[PDB]
Design a protein around this nucleic acid. Sequence first.
RNA 1: AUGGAGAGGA
Lengths: 263, 43, 559, 196, 49, 158, 65, 159, 114, 133, 141, 84
Amino acid sequence: EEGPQVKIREASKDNVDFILSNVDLAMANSLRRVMIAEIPTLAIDSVEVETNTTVLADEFIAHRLGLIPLQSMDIEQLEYSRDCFCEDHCDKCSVVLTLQAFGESESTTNVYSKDLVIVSNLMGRNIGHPIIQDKEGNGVLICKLRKGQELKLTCVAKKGIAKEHAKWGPAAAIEFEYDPWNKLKHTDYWYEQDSAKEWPQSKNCEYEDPPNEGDPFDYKAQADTFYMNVESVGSIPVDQVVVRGIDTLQKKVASILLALTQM
Amino acid sequence: TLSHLRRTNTPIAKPRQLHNTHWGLVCPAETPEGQACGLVKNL
Amino acid sequence: RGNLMGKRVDFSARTVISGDPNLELDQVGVPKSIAKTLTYPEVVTPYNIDRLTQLVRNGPNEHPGAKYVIRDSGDRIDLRYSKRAGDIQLQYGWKVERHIMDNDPVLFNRQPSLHKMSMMAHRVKVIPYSTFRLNLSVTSPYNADFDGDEMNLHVPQSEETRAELSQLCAVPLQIVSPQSNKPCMGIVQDTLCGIRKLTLRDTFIELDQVLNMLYWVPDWDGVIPTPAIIKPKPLWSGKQILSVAIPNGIHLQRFDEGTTLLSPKDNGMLIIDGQIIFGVVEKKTVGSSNGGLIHVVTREKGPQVCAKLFGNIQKVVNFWLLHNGFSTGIGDTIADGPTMREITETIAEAKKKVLDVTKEAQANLLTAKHGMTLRESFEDNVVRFLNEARDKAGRLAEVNLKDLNNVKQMVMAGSKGSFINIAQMSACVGQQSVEGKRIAFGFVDRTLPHFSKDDYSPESKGFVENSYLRGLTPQEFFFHAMGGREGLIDTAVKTAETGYIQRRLVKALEDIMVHYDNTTRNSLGNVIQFIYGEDGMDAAHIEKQSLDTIGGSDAAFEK
Amino acid sequence: ASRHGQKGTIGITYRREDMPFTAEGIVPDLIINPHAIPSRMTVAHLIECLLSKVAALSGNEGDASPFTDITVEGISKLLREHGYQSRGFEVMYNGHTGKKLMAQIFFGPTYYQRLRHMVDDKIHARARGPMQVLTRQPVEGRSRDGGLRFGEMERDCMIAHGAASFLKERLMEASDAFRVHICGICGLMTVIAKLN
Amino acid sequence: FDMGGYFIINGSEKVLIAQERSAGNIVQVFKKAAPSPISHVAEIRSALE
Amino acid sequence: ANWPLPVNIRRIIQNAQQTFHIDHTKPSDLTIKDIVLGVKDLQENLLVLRGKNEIIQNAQRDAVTLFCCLLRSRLATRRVLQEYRLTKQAFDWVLSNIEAQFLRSVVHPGEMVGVLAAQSIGEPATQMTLKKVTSGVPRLKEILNVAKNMKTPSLTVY
Amino acid sequence: MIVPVRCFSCGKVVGDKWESYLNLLQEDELDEGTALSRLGLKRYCCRRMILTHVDLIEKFLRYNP
Amino acid sequence: YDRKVPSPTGEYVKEPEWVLETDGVNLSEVMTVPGIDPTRIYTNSFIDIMEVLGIEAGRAALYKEVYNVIASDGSYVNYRHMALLVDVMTTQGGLTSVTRHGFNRSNTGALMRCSFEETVEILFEAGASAELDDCRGVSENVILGQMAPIGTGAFDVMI
Amino acid sequence: MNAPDRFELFLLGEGESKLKIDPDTKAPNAVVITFEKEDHTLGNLIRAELLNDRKVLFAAYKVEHPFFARFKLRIQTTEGYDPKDALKNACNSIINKLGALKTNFETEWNLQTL
Amino acid sequence: SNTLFDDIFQVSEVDPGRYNKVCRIEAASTTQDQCKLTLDINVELFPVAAQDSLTVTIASSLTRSWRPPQAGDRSLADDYDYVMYGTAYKFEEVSKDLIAVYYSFGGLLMRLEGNYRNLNNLKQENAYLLIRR
Amino acid sequence: EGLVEYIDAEEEESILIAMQPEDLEPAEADVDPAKRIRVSHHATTFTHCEIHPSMILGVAASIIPFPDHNQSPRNTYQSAMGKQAMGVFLTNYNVRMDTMANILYYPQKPLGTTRAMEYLKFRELPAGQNAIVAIACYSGY
Amino acid sequence: KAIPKDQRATTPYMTKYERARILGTRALQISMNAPVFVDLEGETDPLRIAMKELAEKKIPLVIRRYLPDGSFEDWSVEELIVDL
RNA sequence: AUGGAGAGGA
Ligand SMILES: [Mg+2]
Ligand SMILES: [Zn+2]
Ligand SMILES: [Zn+2]
Ligand SMILES: [Zn+2]
C-alpha cells in the first residue's frame, strides 16, 4: 500500500516485534503515547464492600481490584458511564462482578481473579472476563483468608483510559528504538576510552548497515525505520493495541478536523 | 522503635565531639542535629 | 519582646514550597485552598461591581469567590450560611471580603528573616496542588531549597498597604540589592548547567527546534533570525537563539584569563546590543554577579524588564535542556587506569615525606621554627605535607576528567560543585581535623586501640588516604566520623551565636534613617554621619568602575 | 529521600508517556536532579544504584556491606556480563518527542524511603479566627486554626523596606487593635468610659 | 518482632532513656585557668555503690 | 582603581556610540569649549546637598569629589574625541544623561538605614562556617562585644 | 503484604506469578535469577517487583480473629 | 609582604618588604622604638589604637577589622553599612558596645531600650527618674501600634 | 487536597471549546491556536507534519504549564495560504498515513502464526 | 545588493580544540602576502583538511523572518558548498597600511587581514561568507 | 570457653585489637587497583582481634548501603531520617491502637543490604521501596 | 515654626516613599468612589488610576517634610519631580 | 482555655 511500512518480525499472543518503515519520528512516537495511555479498556472502578474480616483493609483490596485485567475486546460497544444516559451504572456501560470467598480450610484459603463472577447482563459482548494467562488457570492473587475470614464484594467496572489512571493502561511495556549505530548523531555517547567497545550493540544493529568510517557525516538524512515491540497486559490482544492505537490517534486527530467545521 | 530503646541522654568540657573511645560502643553516625547534637547518642 | 514587638497575626498562611520553571519571577504559586481562605476587603465601587456581585454569587468555595459582605451599619453577612447568600444587592460603599486572586500583591517570606529580601512582594498566580511554588531564581534572597522548607505569606488589607507592597517590597524592585551594591538573584542549577550547555560553540540547533524555542520566548517579536549556517543545511548556533531573550541596547563586555576578541578558548563574554558575539554563557555572566547580565539589564532597561528576563532565559534554556538532557553516574567518578596508579604514587610519596620528617625529628635533627616548638613545627609540617598531597592527587584527577564528564561540567557551568568535591570523590579525601589539629590521642598516647602508642604517622593520626569511590577503611571511617561531627556541632552553635549577633546589631542601629537634610541620625537627633555613607548615595545604584587616572605610566598618562 | 542524606519533595508527577524511556521500554518511577550529587559527595547512592541494577537482573541480593571488597569495577564487569553499559548508563528517549536524549542517563533501582511530613499535614491558612483570652492576640498552632507569628525579626524586615502603614496594619487590624480611654490630666486609663 | 525494654503506663508505652553521668570514686587532676589562685586541683566524686 | 561609584559611565558611553551610530573615520563637531566647559558646569548641578550657604555647599564639594575624579578622567578632551569620537549632540546627551542617572542614585530621605546596615552585616555573618588569627564568627563576636579579653591580640610592625 | 498486582514502573501483570515463583525456587529448586527469567519477567523493573516483594500477609494471617 | 607602590617612572610595580608580627600588645612602647616606621605600625587591637592614637583613628581600625572578618570569609559588604555600624559605636566618644552595656545605656527613649535586654529594670528606674519619652523611635510606635516614622511615615500628608 | 480530577485531562469543562484561534499581533498571516484538553501526543505530531508542507513559514507548539492539558500551536503561512487550511491539510495527511499504516500492519499481522 | 571581497586561500592548520562539530582554520592567501585568515569551520558539515585550498567571498546580499526554501525554486548567490551569515564587531589597526576585521556568525568567528578592503568592508550588521570546493 | 571477652573503655586502654582477622595476621609476602588501600599488619602483639568493624555502627546506621563510600555528615542525616521512614513498625498494627500509625502498602526488601539488616529484622520489616531512579535534568520541575 | 517658599534644601525629587504613600493615599480615596481627576483610559484598578493621576501631575496633596529641629517644609505634588 | 515536659521539620 501507499505510506508507512510495517514488517512484523516476531509475533506472539503478547509480543509484536516490528520494524516500522517510512514515518516521521513525531508520528512513530505519538503512536506510542497513544498505545500507552489513550486506547480505552475496562477495569474495576467502583467497589462496594459488604464484609471484610481479612488481613487487608477496605481500600487496599478496592485498589487491587482496579489493576485486575478484564477482556476489553468489544469494549468499543460499551459506553463511558459518564456519557451514558442512566444514573450511576447500567448494562450499556458497566459490567458488575462479585467476589465471594470465606475461609473454610485450615490451610490459607486464597482469593484469585479466577474467583470473580460476571453478574451484569453482558448482552452478548465479549467483555469483562478476568483475563488469565496463569498456567494453572487462576489469574492474579487478590487476597488471602484465614480460617474464619470472609470477604464479599461487588465491583462495577467501567470504560477508561490510562490518562484517567494507569489501571486502564492496555499496554504495559513498549520497546522503541531508531537508528542502531547513532548514524544521525542524535546522542553523544559518554565514553571512557572507546565509545564502541564500551557501549553494546542492540539486536536491531543487524537490520541496518555499518557506518563505514571513511564516509563524512550525513547531515541531510532524517528519521526513518523505527524498531518496536508492543507487549500487551492482555485485556486487548497484541495486534489490537497497535491497530486500536493507530485508530484512536487517528480518531483524536480527526476530531480536530471536525472541531474546525463547527466554528 | 529499635533505635529509640538504645538511646543515651547526657544533661547540661567539649562533650559533643565524638571522642575516640566511643569506638564500637557509641554509634559514630546516629545523633540529632542542632539542639542537643552529640549530647544524645545511640549504642 | 513577644506580644508587642512581634505579634501573632491574621490573614497569614504557610506551606511546603516547590520550585517552578514556567512561573514568572515575581510570582508566588498559591494553592487554591489557601487562596480560598485568605481574604482582601474590597470596597464596592462603580467600576468593579459587575466582577464583584459575581464574586458573591460564586460563594465561598469555588475559586474566584468570597465570604462575608459588610454593610452600612457595619454588620457582617456570612456567605457560607445566610438565607440571602445566593442573592444580595451590592450597594455602593459596602465592603466585600473576596478570595485572594490572580495578580494580587502578597508578602512572601521565609524564616529565619535576615533581610529586606527575606520579605518580598509577589503577584498571586493561583494554582492546584498543595505547595507554594516559586521561580528557581527567587531562591537566594529567601535562601530556599526544596528539601522540605515551609514559607509564610501575609496579605495586605488596605489599598495603601498594597501600594507599599508593590511599590517598595516587590521582587523586581529588590533584584538589585543595596547589600553588596550587586544584584542578588540569578540563574541556577538546570538553567545554568543548560545555558553553558546550549552555548558552547559545538552546540548547533536545526530548524524544527529553532522554531519551538523561538515560540517559547514570550517576548518574541515573531521574526526568525537568519541562521549562522545556510550551506549544506541551515542550523542556528547555541548562542544564536538565546540571544533572542536578551533585550536591546544591552552591551556587555568581560574578557577572562586568555581572552582576545577571538576567544579561542571561547573565553569571556561580549554582548553587542541584545545579541551575543562570542564566549560560553555561564555564571560569571548570568549569575548573581557584579558586572553580570542581570546587573546591567536592571539598571539599563528597568526592574520589570529584568524581572521578565529571568523568565525568558529560563523558558528557552529549560526547554533546550529538557530535550538534550543531563545526568551523573559513578562513571563520572572513575578516573584513568594510569591516573589511578599515578594518583597512588602521588600519595605514596607524601607518605615517605612524612616518614622521613618524623624519622628526622625523632632523631632531634628537626630545627624548631622561630617562636614555635619542635613538636609544633613538625605538626605544622606534616599537615602541610598531606594537604599538598590531597591537592596534588585531586589535581591529577581533575586533569584526567575529560570535557564530557558530567561532574566536571557542572564545575565549568558553576551550577554546583567545586574542585575539592572532585579531589575527594575520585582521588583521596585528605586529612581529618578537629579542634584545628589533626586527630587526637583520645586513648592513652594512641588514636584507636588498633595502633601502638606514640604513632604520629599519617594513617594513625587521621589521614584518609582513600577516595569515596574506593571506600574508607574502618579507622579512616571513624576518623572521618570525628571531623564530620565537629562540623555539625559548630554549624549548630555557629548559627545560634549568629542570630544573636544579628539581634543586637539590629537593635543597636534600629532607629537610624536618612533625614530630609540628607544627614544620618537616630531618634534624639544625634547625628551619626553627616552624609549617608560619606557620599550621600543609596547602595542600590552604585557600581564597581575603574578609575584610570590612578594606574598607568607617568608617560602613558600624558600620551 | 533515598538512603544517604539525599532528601527531597516531589515537584510534579508525569504519567508514563510524558516520562523519558529506555529503549527496552522501561520508565523511571523517580527522577532526581544531578545537582544534588557533586556537593554532598553522596557517592554510596551512585554505587548502590549500580549494584541494585545488577542484583535485580542477576536475581540475587546486593552486598552493600560497609567494609568489603565489593568494587564499582567488579560490579561493572558484572553488569557488562549482563548486556548493559557497565556504569549504569542507558540511552533514553525524550517522552514528548521520541528523540534520543543526547546525553545518556544514569538509571537504576535505588532503595528509596518515604518520610513522614506530607503537604496536607502542614498546609495551613488563616484569615480571622480565635484569639487568646489574655492578649486578644490570635491563638497558636495550625491544629487550632491559629495564626502565623509576625516575628520580631520580620518586623525588622518591614522597617528595612520603609513599609510603615503595613507594619502598623500587620500589627493592628491583624492581631489586636484596641480603643482605650485617656485622661487629659494625669494621663492614664482611669477614665470610666460610660459610652452611649 | 516487638522487642520490649519499655514499660506500659496508662496504655502508653514509656521508654527509659539511659542517663549518662560522670563516674564516681575516681581520681582526676585538672589544670586550672589563668586568673585562679589554684594552679592544679585533684578531685574525687565520692559515693557508696 | 576599581571602586563603587554611582552612574556607570562606560555604559552611558557605549549607549551613545550605539544610539547615534558613530563611525571612526570621520571628524567630530565639538569645540574644545563644548567639552572642557560642559564638563565643568555639569559638575555644578550634580546636586546631592542643596543648601545655598557656606558650610552646606562645602559639604557638596566633598560629597561629589570622588565621583568627579572619574567624571573628569573620562570626559577629558583628548579622550572624548580620540577614544570615543562623540558628536556635539551625542555628547550633549552623554552629559545630559549622567546627570539624570546621577540624581536617581541619591538616597531617599526615609531610607531606614539602621535596620538595613545591621542585616547587611548580620546575614553574611550567618553564612560563615569552618595560619593562627581570630577570624569568622568568634572574631566578629569579640569585635561587637568590645572584647577587652581578646584571644589573638597582635602588632604588625613596619 | 501480598504481591503487587502489576508492576509499578513497567505496568505488566506480576501478581498471578507469586505462587509459581515460590514453586520454581522451592520445589524445582532453581536460583531466584532463573525462576524470574522463566516466568518471563525480562525487564528489570518487572523483575524486582517479585524478587523484592515481602509476603508479610502470612505473618498477618497468623493472628486470631 | 608585598606592597603595590610607585616606581618613579609612574607605573605601580611590585615592591616586596619585610614585616614583623606579634603575640601580645603594647603599642605605647613599640612605635616609640627606633628603626620601625611609626607612621604605619598596626595592631589588630582596635581597642588599643583607640586609647593610643585617638578616637577617630580608633574608628578606622574598628572598621578595617569588621571589614576583614567579612571579606576574609569570601563576602563583600558595601562600605556604608559597616561604616554606619562602626560610626554608631564610635560617636559617643568611646567604644560603646553592641550589648546591654553599650548602646542600651545611652539616654534614648525608655520604651525603646526596654525592648532589648534588661526589660523590667529599664522601666523601673526609668519610672523612678520620671523619664519622658520622645516617641520618635521605631520600637516605640510599634509598641504603641501607630505609624512609626519610617520611610512611608517620615513625612506628613495634607491637602 | 487541592489536586484536580484526572478527567480534566481530556474532558472539556463549562464554556471551554476544543480550539480557540487568534490573530498573532506580531507577524502578518500568523495564527496562535490554543488547544484545550490535549498534549504533546497531538501538538508535537501536527507541528512536525505542518512542516513538510512546502508552503509554510513557521510552525511551533508549547505546553504553557503542564498542570494543564492545553498547548499553543502557532503557524505562519505564505502570502495567499490561510493557516487554517495549512492545518486542515496537515491533519488530513496524518489521517491518510495512519489509514494506510493500519491496513499495511493488518496485512502483515495476518501472515504470521502464533 | 552586490559583493564586498573575494579571494582564494590555502589552509595551513586545522584545530579541533576539543570540539567535534567545529574547527578553527589558519589559512593564507594565494596572491597577497599581506593577508591571512582565521575562521571556525563546521567540519562535520564541510570538512576542511590541512594543505587544502579554499575559495572565500563576502557579499551581503543573495532582515525579515528567514524563509525556508520554496527558494528551491529561487536563485541564490551560491555556486558554493558552505555559507554563513554574521555580524562584524571590531575593526583593528595593525599599524601601516594594514587592517583587520572580526566576524561572528553566531560564535564561529573570523580574522581577516590586508589593506584594499578599506573602502570595501563596511562597519556593518550585514556580512555573509561563502566557501566553495 | 574463653574465645570471646567483654571489654570496657578503661580496660580497652591496655590491649591491641586487630581489624581483619584474615588480612591482619597470617604471614607476609598482584593487587586489583580497584580495592581501597589499607595500612598493614603493623605492630605484632594483638591480644584480641575485633569481631567485625561494621559493629561500630548503631541500629540506624547499619541500614545505610556502602556508608563507608560517604562523606560522614550524610550518614548522620540518613540516621535521623530512617526513624521517620514510613513502613511496618509491628506485624500487629491491626490489633494495636495508637495515636497515629502509618504503614507502607507494599514494603520491599532493599536490593542493596548491609550484612547487619539480617539481625535488625529489616529485610522482614522494611520501610522503603526499591524504585527505579533516573538521575537527569528533565523539565526542571 | 514655618520655612518660606524660598531657602529649601529638600530634594525637589519625590522620595519613593513619598510617592508610594501618595499612590496609596490616592488609591485609598479612589477605591471609596471619590471623584477622579483624569479620563480613566479603560482602567478601573483604584491604584492604576492613581499612577495615571500622578503621571499627569493632577493630585492635590502637599507633602509636609520634617527637618530634625522640629521645622518642616511643604511641597505640592506639583513642584515635585517624579523621576524613578 | 492555662501552666509544664519531650520528640520533630528548615
Ligand atoms: Mg531546606
Ligand atoms: Zn449506564
Ligand atoms: Zn486623670
Ligand atoms: Zn517492569
